[PDB]
């Protein structure tokens, strides 16, 4: 339930060892957690939210100019003044004009003029500052077991129901323990700082569009500053990027307004990331976090239940997800009580001989009338298998044929973990879920290597990192001893592999 | 001495982080009883049970009995990640800091 068919879920499991698991939650794709005991859960990060936001520089990306005033001065009597200067609403620049005869100024040879006009503005660009404080992660979670067609849509009665829960996590309140009556505790101890690396990011507000920029990007764009300070007709800083001053061949300098750069900043934006909503609760998408998920009490509630004997009929044909696990809905009637179901799978019809992993482990029933439905899921072995769900002579079966190899599972897991290591950076170490030796050691060595890498190649862009990766590869053979050549080949492989990432 | 004083701890203000790597926390204590100590911890482990870092202000305390006595604490987290633990072993509120140096 709640995570099937997301193409980004991951199966995390710790051999008994106490409850420690410290799973890393991403946005867009959930995670699912299982154990020997402990009814399996799955945590999705659905929404992050930053509540109150400061007001850094707005900008102006579309200007209009009012009346143009000029004031040209002779070649003596110095430079020019223009009384409608010395207020900040007008933007001025000074040039030189021939100023000969049949033009006044009886000395010919290059006087000056200061021809200049008003800088009005419409459609500010409205940067906002966000801090790692007073944001709000909003993770939701489910458990397997009951709940046919949980299937996100209704999601409001289910948090009153026992299976699904909704955990809101602030850095003011990182510890969180939402109840599941009949299941248990779920002691989330999460880290709402290290995830998206905020306070380097600003929240930008165009015409009813919002995203997150890096702040060094935000300070360096050449448009007029609003500064941030309020009410007053606004003191535009710069002012000189938008209006442009072209002189006719020697005389009568004029001003083009150079209209809206909305599309210009939209196409100069390329690598930012969008954010949907802006109330006084700016609500936003993709960005990860980490949780030590403590499992201290997850009672199963179904182990005491007696398994029930009647005919089990499918409605869904059992369908394979992208990961190899198989979800299968199984309704029935005929017997009653909150019963267990058997859910095993075998290689042969004769011996029951349960082979392979049961994801849903201990599925139950809600006691009810005709066709309780329950939609459990399984994990077959790599070859052929019979999924068997009934009890006795009317046990319902299905041939499966998983068709994925054993070494192919390890290869796809290596690709998935390498995508974790490319996207997350250091935090993919300790997604490997125990506080072991070469998890803290791995976090340390990848901390120093990732810090040195981000310091040297400070955001090397797409084509840039492809080209420098090819150059470091070509230097990576080329030459002398296997110390310098090997590290050149290594950094080139890291760059080309980081371009082999999420591009699709 | 100033006995441990289990109570309810609600923050007055959102804590912060000086440029000389220290943390400033202001708590209310919700006014149980009298002048008595409030312990704080840096936790790299769970919500409880492991101190790291270093408290700057030694013997932090509540002076007066009534509702909100505001004690401010200067703290020194370790270089990695850490939570802040305030007095009660069970009923308390925590943080995260990510020292960043």
């Amino acid at each position: 339930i709640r995570c099937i068919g997301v193409s980004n879920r991951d199966f995390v499991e710790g051999m008994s060892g106490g409850t420690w698991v410290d799973v890393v939650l991403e946005h867009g794709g959930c995670v699912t957690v299982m154990a020997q005991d402990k009814p399996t859960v799955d945590i999705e990060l659905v929404t992050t939210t930053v509540s109150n936001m400061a007001e850094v520089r707005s900008y102006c990306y579309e200007a209009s100019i009012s009346d143009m005033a000029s004031d040209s001065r002779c070649p003596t009597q110095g430079e020019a003044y223009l009384d409608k200067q010395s207020d900040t609403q007008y933007v001025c620049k000074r040039t030189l004009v021939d100023r000969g005869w049949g033009n006044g100024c009886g000395l010919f040879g290059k006087g000056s003029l200061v021809t200049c006009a008003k800088f009005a503005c419409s459609k500010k660009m409205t940067g906002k500052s966000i801090q790692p404080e007073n944001l709000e992660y909003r993770i939701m979670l489910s458990v397997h077991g009951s709940q046919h067609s949980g299937m996100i849509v209704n999601d409001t009665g289910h948090e009153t129901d026992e299976n699904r829960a909704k955990v809101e996590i602030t850095p003011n309140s990182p510890r969180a323990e939402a109840t599941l009556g009949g299941f248990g505790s779920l002691g989330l101890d999460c880290e709402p700082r290290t995830g998206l690396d905020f306070s380097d990011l600003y929240y930008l507000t165009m015409n009813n569009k919002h995203w997150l920029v890096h702040k060094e990007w935000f300070h360096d764009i050449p448009l007029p500053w609003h500064a941030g300070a309020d009410t007053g007709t606004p003191h535009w800083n710069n002012k000189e990027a938008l209006v442009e001053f072209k002189d006719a061949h020697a005389k009568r300098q004029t001003v083009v307004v150079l209209g809206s750069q909305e599309g210009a900043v939209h196409t100069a934006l390329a690598g930012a990331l969008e954010a949907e909503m802006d109330g006084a609760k700016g609500r936003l998408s993709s960005g990860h976090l980490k949780c030590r998920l403590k499992m201290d009490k997850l009672r199963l509630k179904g182990v005491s239940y007696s398994l029930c004997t009647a005919a089990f009929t499918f409605t869904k044909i059992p369908a394979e997800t992208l990961h190899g696990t198989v979800t299968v809905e199984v309704q029935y009637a005929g017997t009653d009580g909150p019963c267990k179901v058997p859910a095993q799978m075998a290689v042969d019809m004769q011996t029951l001989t349960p082979v392979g992993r049961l994801i849903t482990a201990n599925p139950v029933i809600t006691e009810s009338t005709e066709n309780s439905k329950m939609m459990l899921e399984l994990d077959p072995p790599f070859g052929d298998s019979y999924i068997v769900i009934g009890v006795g002579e009317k046990k319902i079966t299905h041939h499966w044929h998983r068709s994925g190899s054993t070494i192919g599972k390890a290869f796809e897991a290596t690709v998935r973990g390498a995508k974790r290591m490319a996207v997350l950076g250091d935090t993919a170490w300790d997604f490997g879920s125990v506080g072991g030796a070469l998890n803290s050691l791995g976090k340390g060595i990848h901390q120093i290597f990732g810090a040195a890498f981000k310091s040297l190649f400070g955001g090397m862009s797409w084509f840039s990192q492809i080209l420098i990766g090819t150059l470091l590869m070509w230097l990576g053979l080329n030459t002398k001893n296997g110390s310098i050549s090997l590290m050149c080949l290594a950094l080139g492989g890291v760059l080309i592999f980081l371009s082999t990432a999420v591009s699709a | 001495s100033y006995s441990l004083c289990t109570a309810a701890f609600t923050f007055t203000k959102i804590p912060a982080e000086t440029l000389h790597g220290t943390v400033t926390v202001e708590v209310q204590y919700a006014g149980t009883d009298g002048p008595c100590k409030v312990p704080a911890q840096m936790a790299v482990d769970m919500q409880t049970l492991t101190p790291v870092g270093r408290l700057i202000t030694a013997n932090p305390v509540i002076t007066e009995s009534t509702e909100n006595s505001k004690m401010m604490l200067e703290l020194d987290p370790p270089f990695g990640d850490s939570y802040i633990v305030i007095g009660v072993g069970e009923k308390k509120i925590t943080h995260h800091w990510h020292r960043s140096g």
Partner: antibody
Amino acid sequence: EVQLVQSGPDVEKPGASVKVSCKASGYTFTSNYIHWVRQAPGQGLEWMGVINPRGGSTASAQKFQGRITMTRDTSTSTVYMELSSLRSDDTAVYYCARGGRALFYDSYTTPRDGGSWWFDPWGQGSLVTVSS
Amino acid sequence: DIQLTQSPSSLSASVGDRVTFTCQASQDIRKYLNWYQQKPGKAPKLLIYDASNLKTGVPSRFSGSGSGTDFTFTISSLQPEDVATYYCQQFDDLPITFGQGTRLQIK
């Protein structure tokens, strides 16, 4: 005692500018933000803006951008509000009351409030009438 | 900007009654709300700072509460000198908004 006292009522023409004073007594003048709040006869209260009497910083609402400017006088302990581009909508009663926490400069809000957030020294209520 | 709806518009009650006022912001104001009563054209009388606290000098018949966005002001015993126009005030984010008002009348 702690009290803000304002000037008398004024009658101005549309398109002109009015100036309302706000003098302090009983407290340190550079320790409390002076907030200006209008009130039309019928329509309730409406916050015009804020000055700090230390350093003369100002901010105001979006409905008055470019129309209002606030100056100070640390010697006489007085706050001047000049409202320009007067309309028939500006016929109201203007008030000024100390925000309070006024440590450094400008509005401060995630820090503490209350205790005459600004509900104590409100001078009197300067009637400003804009007509011919 | 941070709309602050004040319910109801006006009321009337006899001397010694309990009455409640509701203020709902469209946004989360934490505990940042304040409460005025203003006699018409006069220096007012003080009710509530920080949405739950009385000030020294205020008689204790006034009280306030409210946690998320809904806030309830409560007069325990109405008195003939409590006829005024009742306002509530946001504190958060700036363009500090007042309620429309709540008038009372002596029966």
